[PDB]
């Protein structure tokens, strides 16, 4: 039960590191899943404020 725990920890950490992305102050981010953009608040395109956000 020693290889499995370190393996799950390291893969979880690398998955989280891949997931996180930061939008710089001067820019704004648009997210694309497959082709389309994410829609929110009654089918309105969403733009990311310059803050840390999580992507799949």
């Amino acid at each position: 039960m020693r290889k499995s725990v370190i393996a799950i920890i390291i893969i979880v950490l690398v998955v989280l590191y891949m997931s996180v992305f930061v939008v710089k102050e001067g820019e704004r981010g648009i997210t694309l899943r497959f082709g389309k953009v994410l829609r929110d608040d009654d089918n309105k395109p969403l733009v990311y404020e310059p803050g840390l956000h999580f992507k799949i």
Partner: peptide
Amino acid sequence: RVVTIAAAAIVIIWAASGFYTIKEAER
């Protein structure tokens, strides 16, 4: 049982090669 394995392989190939994505600007 090899025929069942072949059927599983062909249906998996059918499912995997069928999916496609098109960009937002495109239709």
